[PDB]
Design an enzyme around this catalytic site. Structure first.
Site, PDB file in Angstrom:
ATOM      1  N   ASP B 334     122.059  69.108  35.992  1.00 39.73           N
ATOM      2  CA  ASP B 334     122.282  68.170  34.888  1.00 39.73           C
ATOM      3  C   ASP B 334     122.303  66.725  35.474  1.00 39.73           C
ATOM      4  O   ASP B 334     121.351  66.333  36.193  1.00 39.73           O
ATOM      5  CB  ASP B 334     123.539  68.600  34.076  1.00 39.73           C
ATOM      6  CG  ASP B 334     123.801  67.709  32.849  1.00 39.73           C
ATOM      7  OD1 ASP B 334     123.204  67.976  31.754  1.00 39.73           O
ATOM      8  OD2 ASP B 334     124.590  66.735  32.980  1.00 39.73           O
ATOM      9  N   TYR B 465     125.852  57.988  31.057  1.00 37.00           N
ATOM     10  CA  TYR B 465     124.815  57.992  30.025  1.00 37.00           C
ATOM     11  C   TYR B 465     124.584  56.617  29.489  1.00 37.00           C
ATOM     12  O   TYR B 465     123.728  56.426  28.619  1.00 37.00           O
ATOM     13  CB  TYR B 465     125.237  58.812  28.825  1.00 37.00           C
ATOM     14  CG  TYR B 465     125.210  60.301  29.012  1.00 37.00           C
ATOM     15  CD1 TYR B 465     124.057  61.046  28.758  1.00 37.00           C
ATOM     16  CD2 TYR B 465     126.329  60.966  29.434  1.00 37.00           C
ATOM     17  CE1 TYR B 465     124.032  62.423  28.911  1.00 37.00           C
ATOM     18  CE2 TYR B 465     126.319  62.339  29.589  1.00 37.00           C
ATOM     19  CZ  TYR B 465     125.182  63.055  29.321  1.00 37.00           C
ATOM     20  OH  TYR B 465     125.232  64.410  29.473  1.00 37.00           O
ATOM     21  N   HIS B 523     122.358  76.346  29.582  1.00 37.54           N
ATOM     22  CA  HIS B 523     122.588  75.082  30.285  1.00 37.54           C
ATOM     23  C   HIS B 523     123.594  75.144  31.464  1.00 37.54           C
ATOM     24  O   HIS B 523     123.450  74.384  32.419  1.00 37.54           O
ATOM     25  CB  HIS B 523     123.037  73.981  29.299  1.00 37.54           C
ATOM     26  CG  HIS B 523     123.371  72.688  29.975  1.00 37.54           C
ATOM     27  ND1 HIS B 523     122.398  71.826  30.454  1.00 37.54           N
ATOM     28  CD2 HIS B 523     124.572  72.149  30.331  1.00 37.54           C
ATOM     29  CE1 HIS B 523     123.000  70.817  31.070  1.00 37.54           C
ATOM     30  NE2 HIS B 523     124.315  70.976  30.991  1.00 37.54           N
TER      31      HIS B 523
HETATM   32  O1  LIG Z   1     121.528  72.720  26.163  1.00 37.73           O
HETATM   33  C1  LIG Z   1     122.429  73.516  25.980  1.00 37.73           C
HETATM   34  O2  LIG Z   1     122.232  74.835  26.232  1.00 37.73           O
HETATM   35  C2  LIG Z   1     123.836  73.205  25.499  1.00 37.73           C
HETATM   36  N1  LIG Z   1     124.227  71.854  25.874  1.00 37.73           N
HETATM   37  C3  LIG Z   1     125.413  71.203  25.613  1.00 37.73           C
HETATM   38  C4  LIG Z   1     125.280  69.948  26.173  1.00 37.73           C
HETATM   39 BR1  LIG Z   1     126.485  68.450  26.245  1.00 37.73          BR
HETATM   40  C5  LIG Z   1     123.980  69.979  26.734  1.00 37.73           C
HETATM   41  C6  LIG Z   1     123.316  68.846  27.475  1.00 37.73           C
HETATM   42  C7  LIG Z   1     122.386  69.260  28.550  1.00 37.73           C
HETATM   43  C8  LIG Z   1     123.703  68.621  28.890  1.00 37.73           C
HETATM   44  N2  LIG Z   1     123.330  71.126  26.564  1.00 37.73           N
END
Ligand SMILES: O=C(O)Cn1cc(Br)c(C2CC2)n1
Ligand SMILES: O=C(O)Cn1cc(Br)c(C2CC2)n1
Ligand SMILES: [Mg+2]
Ligand SMILES: [Mg+2]
Lengths: 546, 546
Positions: B334, B465, B523
């Site tokens: 991430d 961000y 994720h």
């Molecule tokens: O994408 C998913 O599976 C669920 N998700 C919740 C968040 Br905050 C995100 C962002 C990529 C960080 N994804």
């Protein structure tokens, strides 16, 4: 007036210059003179090299451009490049050939030490070759000695462009007249001169240093041999491991490579290794310098038995476990020295190699109580003085500055005799209230110790001496063993307590023991003779622990 | 009734047994059957072996005695030992041949997990051979999974002597009837049986496990594949580095070997790597698992620009400097994934190799504002929601348990759509007050995060961000470069934000990129599919970073 000194890397802080391998290769290969420099410089401000020095492209992207350039130059000069001609090859070799130019570094160091702001300003590249670690090591080793490092490929500008000198000045927070700038290329000096900086054209180092000495009025040439790099405590990585519920151990950690665990003596600190930490990291080791149980940021439980060698050793083993270290090299001094011998004897699978400063390995005598062994040697009287809980605590804690200033003294400076300490009623009964500073230590350093010992005082430290019977009994279990892993004993000529001759029988228990010996060195070995200690440990590490 | 399980090392937790190389060597070498066992056992309670197992002598001291014993036995049996017969040799080979017997370990693990006290009780030696590290690694790998490790050579007693079972019982704080004891030698079982312990004679593992399953009433055989070892936070080495005056970074550190720096994403923790930390340490790496700036025990300054990629990267470089690391392998997820790509691009000399989970490398588009790039993909709407300082902080901080329970969910469990988050007014507007626990996490684990986020909340995390424009501008400087150091991209099939296809062009920028791919994984990669992650990183580390 002059308040800042700026050094280049290639040709000034590091030699031989990589620029200069173009010249040497041309000769070696019998190419037309300058052919390689022409290819290196082709297209000037718009050619590949400038793009590289600006960080637009990486070194490996650049290599084929330089290749093409070399072919262009050989065509126009109506010659052939030899079979196997390889820019990757020439640059791999040149970049590893380059070393720190020690006398230039020590002058920068001295100027920093007399109050100058120091910087490196260099035209350099983003290096992504297989062998890049080599350059990364050099830069790490240099960058720590300077206030700033300005790299052309990070700021997007290059010498000789005026803007980078403007950036330099701005970074230094100085005006042009306060700055001396040294460079091996005259064209790079010119815009510094335009601004009114002092410039030095560096050809041979010694002449450049003469110019620098003259213009700054500080001695840089012919200076005495300087101490090794020390550690600033707030720049260290501080590590903490809980080895059991009420016990956590602190250490400082520097470098990569085999694990080397440093164990200090009484009444000291991780910081007692401040001279060895960078030297051993620099030599390719992962140094872990402990606060031993009882000290500094480690836990200091009050009970005496928490400090018997058995429990201390088991805790050090746990410390390896929790860090995921199957072994470490153990190096100890004084009580730390005693502990590492016992690690060798009860946990050889965990010890890559063992060394002690001053502390000899003596087996327990199974026919003689340890208290009596101690009463045999008048110079150990201080250990009896340490027996009664509270008595030594009160004297050592009364005045911390005074304590460390009285203890931390070189062989020719000592104020306290270990002689009939009980009878005199104390260790400092015949020493000054305000001792002079020993040559081995600054006021700042003494204050670090003072501050450390304000957290726990001396009860934990002293308890190390309060388990004679208990250590004797555990030691008796090991009387059939020998120490047969790699082992080094370093004796200190003027340690009037842990005298060299006290180690004279060690070979019976450790047949392949190696030795070093340090003259004119008292009990505080690491700070007394830091250069000799470093040389003896690194040589022994490189040959026996690697 | 049964409350404790005790395992031997040789022949039970580790195979092949070293005892058994005596038998095999005899056959191999055509020696009289039993000749080597006779020599190994000569003199019984007073012979060399028992002295060894008791810790009186070390292995290397023992080797020549066994030698002499072997000669004695061959004389009495009127045979010759072959030319080059070598006990050192036979034992070096046998000891390295021995491996953890995985199914026995997993049964011990399962019993520990259902509440048993578990111990290793072993006849073993003080090992001081050149090659001792091998045994030290095994013991480290086993000992962590048990409540106690009792080693004959540390306690001065040996099975089958009655006193060691008395010591065992005393160590376990259990009565004999509460204990099952497994051993491959019947004579060692006998005194356990005399006391009324359940004993298991271990020949083949599966039969022994059947007996153990029957007698404990817990399933040990045919159990589903278990999760990898996790980390208990208070057993870790915690490290702290000040990278500049108001910024100190925390990390957890396990193992030795090349340095591997793990970088978590939003809004996570070092602890997000809890499954990878022991696996990567076990695979021969020095794992440093960070709290990234903004998180956990690292500093969390409030200003937005403290969190732009440029400053974050420079800080990570400083972190290497202060630890004395010329490079590290960088692995990110991430936001951490984004950061490691940029480390590759601006500091390749510091990066041994780079890998990202889920986060693809996308170059800045120099013709399109980054805010607009984001408005192009409806699934990134949550990133616009994060822009206005305070709005997301208030929602995420309102109820920490609820936050992490809503976010940390597997692909088939999700309660929040990233779909028109701004419009709905928030990320949790249509999720429960008390979310159910995801299969990926326990209540205890969720509480660790909660506790971490109570120190700084979400302002620092969210600021990551809030530098779109600033990152875009710094990224534009790198548009001429390629990433040419070792690089791995791991895509997660069901990450509905960082979808696999978002990585499809990466090869244009990273021509020698390697890939792994994980199916049915959302994720939260490391906790969703910890086994697959471990297998993909170790295989890539071993071939590309070593
Ligand atoms: O994408 C998913 O599976 C669920 N998700 C919740 C968040 Br905050 C995100 C962002 C990529 C960080 N994804
Ligand atoms: O021996 C010396 O040079 C001075 N000295 C002071 C003390 Br406390 C000691 C004991 C060895 C720890 N020595
Ligand atoms: Mg130069
Ligand atoms: Mg056995």
């Amino acid at each position: 007036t002059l308040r800042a000194a700026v050094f280049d890397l290639d040709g000034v802080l590091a030699l031989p210059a990589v620029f200069g391998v173009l010249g040497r290769t041309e000769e070696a290969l019998a190419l037309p003179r300058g052919l390689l420099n022409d290819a290196f410089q082709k297209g000037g401000p718009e050619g590949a090299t400038t793009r590289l020095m600006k960080g637009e492209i990486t070194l490996s992207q650049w290599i084929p451009l330089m290749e093409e350039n070399c072919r262009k130059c050989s065509e126009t000069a109506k010659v052939c490049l030899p079979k196997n001609f390889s820019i990757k090859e020439i640059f791999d070799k040149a970049i590893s050939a380059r070393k720190i130019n020690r006398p230039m570094l020590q002058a920068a160091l001295m100027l920093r030490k007399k109050g100058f702001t120091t910087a490196i300003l260099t035209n350099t590249w983003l290096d992504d070759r297989a062998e890049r670690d080599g350059l990364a090591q050099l830069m790490c080793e240099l960058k720590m000695h300077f206030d700033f490092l300005i790299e052309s490929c990070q700021v997007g500008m290059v010498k000789p462009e005026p803007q980078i000198y403007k950036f330099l000045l701005d970074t230094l927070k100085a005006s042009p007249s306060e700055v001396v700038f040294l460079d091996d290329i005259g064209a790079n000096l010119k815009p510094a001169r335009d601004l009114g900086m002092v410039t030095i054209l560096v050809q041979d180092t010694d002449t450049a240093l003469k110019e620098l000495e003259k213009v700054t009025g500080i001695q840089l040439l012919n200076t005495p041999a300087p101490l090794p790099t020390s550690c600033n405590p707030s720049d260290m990585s501080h590590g903490y491991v809980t080895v059991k519920p009420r016990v956590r151990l602190h250490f400082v950690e520097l470098g990569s490579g085999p694990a080397v665990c440093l164990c200090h003596g009484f009444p000291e600190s991780w910081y007692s290794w401040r001279y060895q930490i960078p030297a051993l990291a620099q030599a390719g080791y992962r140094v872990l310098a402990m606060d031993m149980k009882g000290y500094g940021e480690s836990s200091a439980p009050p009970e005496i038995e928490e400090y018997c060698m058995e429990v201390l050793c088991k805790e050090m083993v746990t410390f390896l476990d929790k860090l995921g270290l199957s072994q470490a090299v153990f190096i100890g001094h004084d009580w730390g020295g005693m502990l590492v011998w016992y690690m060798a004897l009860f946990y050889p699978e965990r010890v890559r190699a063992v060394a002690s400063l001053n502390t000899p390995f003596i087996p327990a005598n199974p026919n003689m109580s340890p208290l009596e062994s101690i009463k045999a040697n008048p110079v150990f009287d201080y250990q009896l003085y340490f027996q009664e809980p509270g008595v030594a605590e009160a004297e050592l804690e009364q005045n911390l500055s005074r304590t460390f200033k009285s203890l931390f003294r070189a062989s020719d400076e000592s104020v306290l005799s270990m002689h009939k300490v009980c009878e005199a009623g104390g260790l400092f009964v015949n020493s000054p209230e305000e001792p002079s500073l020993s040559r081995m230590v600054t006021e700042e350093e003494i204050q670090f110790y003072v501050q450390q010992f304000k957290k726990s005082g001396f009860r934990g430290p002293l308890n190390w001496y309060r388990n004679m019977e208990r250590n004797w009994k555990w030691a008796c279990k090991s009387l059939g063993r020998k120490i047969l892993i790699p082992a080094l004993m370093v004796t200190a000529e003027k340690d009037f307590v842990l005298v060299p001759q006290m180690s004279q029988h060690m070979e019976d228990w450790i047949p392949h023991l190696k030795r070093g010996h340090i003259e004119d060195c008292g009990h505080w070995t690491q700070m007394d003779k830091p250069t000799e200690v470093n040389q003896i440990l690194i040589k022994w590490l490189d040959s026996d622990a690697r």
